[PDB]
């Protein structure tokens, strides 16, 4: 079956680093996961991340991201094709 391309990769490959300690699967892509769960930080160390993140790719994440913007599992699937 399919699912061998870069744009499955970004996110596995960088998932991969924090698995080490995260110890979870890049698979949990849920709504009910979040930073809390997914990541090991709260949105408020997630604030400058994302918010210097998106200056990287010249974007508003509050205004462009904000368009279909929910949980960690938009981000992933927008940085996914957002750099492919």
């Known amino acids: 079956g399919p699912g061998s391309m ?12 924090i698995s ?3 110890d979870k699967k890049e698979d949990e892509i849920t709504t009910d996961s979040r930073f809390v769960e997914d990541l090991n930080a709260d949105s408020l160390d997630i604030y400058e991340l994302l918010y210097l993140l998106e200056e990287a790719f010249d974007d508003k994440i509050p205004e462009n991201e904000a368009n279909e913007f929910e949980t960690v599992g938009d981000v992933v699937n927008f940085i996914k094709k957002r750099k492919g």
Request: net charge negative; no cysteine.
């Open 20 to 22: 080490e300690q995260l």
């Open 6 to 17: 870069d744009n499955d990769e970004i996110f596995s490959k960088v998932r991969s680093i």
